[PDB]
Design a binder for these strands. Sequence first.
DNA 1: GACAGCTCTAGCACCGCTTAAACGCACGTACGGATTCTCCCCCGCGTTTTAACCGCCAAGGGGATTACTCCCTAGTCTCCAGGCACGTGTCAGAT
DNA 2: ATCTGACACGTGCCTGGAGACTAGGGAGTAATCCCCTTGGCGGTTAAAACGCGGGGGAGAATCCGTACGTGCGTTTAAGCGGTGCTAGAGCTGTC
Lengths: 94, 97, 97, 102, 102, 89
Amino acid sequence: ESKEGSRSSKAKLQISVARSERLLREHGGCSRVSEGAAVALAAAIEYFMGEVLELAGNAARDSKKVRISVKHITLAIQNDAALFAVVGKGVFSG
Amino acid sequence: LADHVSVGETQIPKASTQHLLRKAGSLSAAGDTEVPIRGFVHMKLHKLVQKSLLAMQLAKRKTIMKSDVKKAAELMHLPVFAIPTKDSGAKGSVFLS
Amino acid sequence: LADHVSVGETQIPKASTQHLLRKAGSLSAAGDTEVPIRGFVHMKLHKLVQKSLLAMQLAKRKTIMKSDVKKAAELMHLPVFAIPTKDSGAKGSVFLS
Amino acid sequence: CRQKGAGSAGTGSETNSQEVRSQMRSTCLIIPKERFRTMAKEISKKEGHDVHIAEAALDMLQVIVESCTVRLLEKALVITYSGKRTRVTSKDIETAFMLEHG
Amino acid sequence: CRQKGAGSAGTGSETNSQEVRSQMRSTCLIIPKERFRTMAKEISKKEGHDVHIAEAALDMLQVIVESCTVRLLEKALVITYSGKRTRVTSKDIETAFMLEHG
Amino acid sequence: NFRLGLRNMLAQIHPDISVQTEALSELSNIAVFLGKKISHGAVTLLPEGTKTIKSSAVLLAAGDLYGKDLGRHAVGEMTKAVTRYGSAK
DNA sequence: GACAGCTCTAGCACCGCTTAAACGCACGTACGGATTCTCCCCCGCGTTTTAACCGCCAAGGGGATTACTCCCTAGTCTCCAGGCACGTGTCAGAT
DNA sequence: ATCTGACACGTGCCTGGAGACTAGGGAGTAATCCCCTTGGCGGTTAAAACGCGGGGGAGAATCCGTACGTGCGTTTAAGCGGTGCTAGAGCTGTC
């Protein structure tokens, strides 16, 4: 019961809950999606992209550059053994 | 790989085959390495086009768009984070040569 | 693999690790082969149980049945065709020892 | 191998060269059930106490494990023969596992 | 590499040792765009005659091929280094392909 | 896509660091594919009897995909976000 | 969803020109193959300890099953403002 | 030092995003039946671990032919760029 803001502002999340619910509901997995699953999915994406952005920013700062590029995002992934296992099968742009 | 190359078709140039080994960190390359390299690039493009063409046939189109390749990429259970938008080609992009 | 085996917990007997090699067709096995083989099975069992526990926990049960492991098996994109039934292990089966 | 019914190829301190020929003719699992049940309950006990394991779930857990373990050891044998060697060493299995996860 | 405004980071002719460090710093693809389009239309001619290929589709097709080829060769380098050799041969690449598909 | 959400996170963490436009599109495609893997994991872990996805389904799906230290810290952040949302409805 | 028709973004082609780049060739040096020798450790066989597995037993813990109750979420209507495209300044970074 | 053109910024808006009943279904809870799981005990006894000569595989050292790094020049074609054309995507409106 707080009408001053959106779903992301109510949960204090920067990832939009409405877009994360659209991914979950329109994935063709199930007929019904609860309200709590939408907030939980947005928080899971938000925490670990904060992990990637923290490692990419430190990698970019160590390279004396103020703009995060593709190579800085790539170099941050294999520098963390736990992060690399999630997206090891992904194509990191050549 | 071994016999996926056929005489009569355009193939990857020999110096481009050696540059693939340099990006993998290989310090020395054999002279017979150009044959499995040319086969594997030819095999992966044959696999990618074949999946993408039947994605085009079902949608009743005649041009392979970026959505048909993307659906062909996820059909092999291979996630692709390189999605070329209209802003591609800017500076040091991953889609350039 | 190398450090997935720990003292204090039960592991595969030494002779059964050599039997796993002979099923693969190896003729000669080194003396320090038991440690990686014990590590891989203990890793694969730890992977399978961890997926199976959460499937059981979410269904509010307390016993890991055949449906929980089946959801655990194909969650790792591994198709399994040896699904046991009530007639399993009859004369010579894929489930006997 | 030690259970009832059938599935055993050959016994009696059978030699190593004959063991490869015999093991391709059998169909039973080669890890004991009691040691596998003790192993399976021990992994669960570290994370959740008082977990019962079904008998049908035990058989299908063991079938997946050996099929992944034998598949790794077949890949380890290829690297051993690629190095012009006939003896599988510790480094060959580590290389075989590294080539698919890493 | 030959595309305008690309981060090639290579300066003309280089030695083999300097080519490894230069290629680890660049981000551009290393197959020319014209010959990749020629190959892309040629294979599609065997199934569907007169099929146009979009420029956006060509970039995504080339990126997938580059990442899959480099991943195979990094795996092919491991087999070469496991055999106490420093020269990647044709057998090493075919072994690396066979260890994942076959 | 998650372009604006991921840009606002970078301002909170590193106030003096910007992001390439091409890098932002790749980070957005990570977010979509991370959403797909968790949601597909949550559908798999559901029993055959149940048909809806609750918060407990996404919590256990994140634990399976994310190993060791990341998985334990995931559940703490997800639960704290749900309880904050459950009191400010 | 198939079909028809109008609109217009974009893919093909080509010519000029450039020019970075690929191919070929001669020189030379490092390296994998061949050979011999030696070490050491693993297969083969005998013995002994030990634990996996039969049958068969029993108690009982929790999986199915059914019935009741009620939490909430797809659906429909209404309202609104926030992110996205278009266009433009200007400074981060390559040279 | 000097571009430059890609990113940050300002504007229009309309379609995404949020708020308020509704009710019907699916989730949760509780009692009850009994199926299947744990524990184990006598005995087996086949398999597992242990120990001891003995030979074959791996490692080390030496030698060398030949296949690959490497300058150098010649040769071929990839790409800017601009142009123009038009095949064909996108969207609308039935039925």
